Amino acid sequence: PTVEYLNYETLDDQGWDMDDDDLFEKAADAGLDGEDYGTMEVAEGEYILEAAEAQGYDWPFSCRAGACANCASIVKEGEIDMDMQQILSDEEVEEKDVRLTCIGSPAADEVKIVYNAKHLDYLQNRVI
Numbered sequence: 001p002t003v004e005y006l007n008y009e010t011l012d013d014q015g016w017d018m019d020d021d022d023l024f025e026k027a028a029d030a031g032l033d034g035e036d037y038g039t040m041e042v043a044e045g046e047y048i049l050e051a052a053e054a055q056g057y058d059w060p061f062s063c064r065a066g067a068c069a070n071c072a073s074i075v076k077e078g079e080i081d082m083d084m085q086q087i088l089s090d091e092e093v094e095e096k097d098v099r100l101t102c103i104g105s106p107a108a109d110e111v112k113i114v115y116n117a118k119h120l121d122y123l124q125n126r127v128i
């Protein structure tokens with residue numbers, strides 16, 4: 001069960017694409033902040049955010065006051081498991097590739113996803 005994490009910020013700075021230049025593959029040819037890009041490996045069933053949090057991987061805990069269901073990531077390929085669901089929408093995982101990484105585990109073997117989505121512009125304005 002391995003999941004490749006890629007800093008969403010490196011996507012803009014490097015000016016690359018998510019699936020065009022295969023950043024997950026081209027990033028290995030350069031050498032960006034290991035904490036930004038790299039292949040994550042966690043046992044199946046272990047909360048990804050936690051398994052990676054032990055290696056130093058940080059995540060924008062987008063947990064609001066009173067329940068929650070909108071962390072901040074972008075699965076580049078693969079599926080993730082998590083508690084029940086209803087508010088979220090498939091269109092969000094297909095058009096935004098976002099999902100739950102805090103207490104969510106990997107549903108497939110090799111799954112790619114962008115970390116630190118907080119940089120997104122859909123939230124940058126609501127940062128303060």
Ligand code: FES
Binds near residue numbers: 060061063102103
């Ligand atoms: S930000 Fe609340 S469960 Fe992830």
